[PDB]
């Protein structure tokens, strides 16, 4: 109840982890989320425009050794989605704590949902002590 | 005494009958535990053939009113033409393999009466006993 929370962009590096990769009608977008992740909180319209880039060659699940060319789409595109969750990564460590987004492993998107579920194996057969002597 | 799978195979039919279950278990066995691939449809085929192999004869025992198998009696008398030997000449002095060597000649013939006679007559009869 006495710490400081700061938000910043990623550490750069690869364009896939740096910018925001998401699907949108066959086209692949890479957006500079610096416009979102730039804030701070103390101790205790309006609207935002996010610049994006387009790419025809991309690598899914980070599987090197292969590629995929997405065909262009004719006409204007305007997908719509809703941000339901985030993927933050916790970064002179007693008050201020900077945070930035992350990704890379796509299993995070599936776990983020499947946590509500688990699978178990039923064992139909059991035994127990009972007052009973079986006759012929 | 536990002998093991087919552990009584080398004994008289009387003796062997002691431990039929030790064999019975592994007649179906169970357990066992890039696509296709060699073995990919072979383990498949084999494991299937095991199931069929089993039930094909099990159903016959279902028809031959016993079910509680390994051993059961019938109401079909033994025809003397089917290898006329004495019980001590058979049960106390012959293995199952040696037995089949002879009796195999009348397999389907015996099955005829087993498949039928009793199964037919045991019933009807009962329905008639249910009259009152």
């Amino acid at each position: 109840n006495n710490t400081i929370i700061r938000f910043a962009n990623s550490s750069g590096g690869d364009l896939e982890v740096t910018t925001h990769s998401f699907n949108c009608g066959g086209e692949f977008f890479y957006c500079n989320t610096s416009g979102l992740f730039n804030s701070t909180w103390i101790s205790n319209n309006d609207s935002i425009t996010l610049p994006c880039r387009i790419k025809q060659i991309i690598n899914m699940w980070q599987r090197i050794g292969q590629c995929m060319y997405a065909p262009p789409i004719q006409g204007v595109i305007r997908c719509v989605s809703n941000i339901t969750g985030l993927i933050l990564t916790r970064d002179t460590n007693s008050t201020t704590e900077t945070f930035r987004p992350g990704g890379g492993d796509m299993r995070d998107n599936w776990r983020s949902e499947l946590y509500k579920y688990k699978v178990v194996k039923i064992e139909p057969l059991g035994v127990a002590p009972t007052r009973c002597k079986r006759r012929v | 005494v536990f002998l093991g799978f087919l552990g009584a195979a080398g004994s008289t039919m009387g003796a062997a009958s002691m431990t039929l279950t030790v064999q019975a278990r592994n007649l179906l066995s169970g357990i066992v535990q890039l696509k296709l691939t060699v073995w990919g449809i072979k383990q498949l085929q084999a494991r299937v053939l095991a199931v069929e192999r089993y039930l094909r004869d099990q159903q016959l025992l279902g028809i031959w009113g016993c079910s509680g198998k390994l051993i059961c009696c019938t109401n079909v008398p033994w025809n003397s033409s089917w290898s006329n030997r004495n019980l001590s000449e058979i049960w106390d002095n012959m293995t199952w393999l040696q037995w089949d060597k002879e009796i195999s000649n009348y397999t389907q013939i015996i099955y005829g009466l087993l498949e039928e006679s009793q199964n037919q007559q045991e019933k009807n009869e009962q329905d008639l006993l249910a009259l009152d």
């Binding site: - | 093991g4 552990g7 195979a9 080398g10 691939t37 060699v38 073995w39 990919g40």
Partner: protein
């Protein structure tokens, strides 16, 4: 099939041509059969062909 149990530990992205194969039992069983005798014919043994 059936090919040992430690051979798979070598891995090397499949050695020779065995990985897709059931591990062997740690105690392979046997039993000598007394009074049991019969013919052996290696020249018609179709195990070879397979």
């Amino acid at each position: 099939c059936a090919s040992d149990a430690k051979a798979y530990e070598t891995e090397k992205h499949n050695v020779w041509a065995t990985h897709a194969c059931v591990p062997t039992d740690p105690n392979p069983q046997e039993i000598h059969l007394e009074n049991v005798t019969e013919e052996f014919n290696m020249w018609k043994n179709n195990m070879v062909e397979q």
